Structure 1
Amino acid sequence: GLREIRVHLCQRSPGSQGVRDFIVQRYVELKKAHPNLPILIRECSEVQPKLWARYAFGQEKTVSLNNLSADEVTRAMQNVLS
């Protein structure tokens, strides 16, 4: 019972190039598909990108997206959402 997704990423670093690509490519489509889902884009400086996904009764998971490409990031995103 997923309740929230939150991507944490960086800028001007390789680790987050795939995540920026994902954001430009497929984020509007994801939102319009499931609009009532909270997707929290959160960028900072000198982090290692992660995707914290939070389920119903107070649990959540995470996966490092460092040195990952846009297609792999979309793979992990769909894995989580599924």
Structure 2
Amino acid sequence: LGLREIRIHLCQRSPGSQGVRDFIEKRYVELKKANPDLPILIRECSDVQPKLWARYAFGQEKNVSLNNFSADQVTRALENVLSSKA
């Protein structure tokens, strides 16, 4: 019925998370000020591939592999997540 949380997983050091890192350094705060009641949980880890989880209503989760994206591609994938709500 609607989006309930976004979970962005990334690495501190891997290059595939690099543009994902460029999403948080530059384009996160006004994202948080766009949806102040939507939890956008950033989870950094050791050797994970970048991943975008979208939990929806009634426990449904969609799963987007954010590996080797630029920051613009991460922005477009996350705005697809925000605009879908399916």
Structure 1: state its 5+ residue gaps.
none
Instruction: Supply the RMSD in Å over aligned alpha carbons.
Output: 0.6
The percent of aligned pairs where both chains have the same amino acid is: 87
**Greater strand proportion:** 2
Measured after TM superposition, the shift of residue 28 of structure 1 is 0.4
Q: Amino acid of the residue matched to residue 27 of structure 1?
A: Y
When normalised by structure 2's length, the TM-score is 0.92
Once the two structures are superposed, the pairs formed by residues 1-82 of structure 1 within 5 Å of their partners are 1-82=2-83
When normalised by structure 1's length, the TM-score is 0.96
Structure 1 residue ranges, 4+ long, deviating more than 4 angstroms after superposition:
none
Structure 2: state its 5+ residue gaps.
none
Per-residue displacement from partner, 1:8-36 (whole Å, max 9, x unpaired)? 11011111001000001111001111101
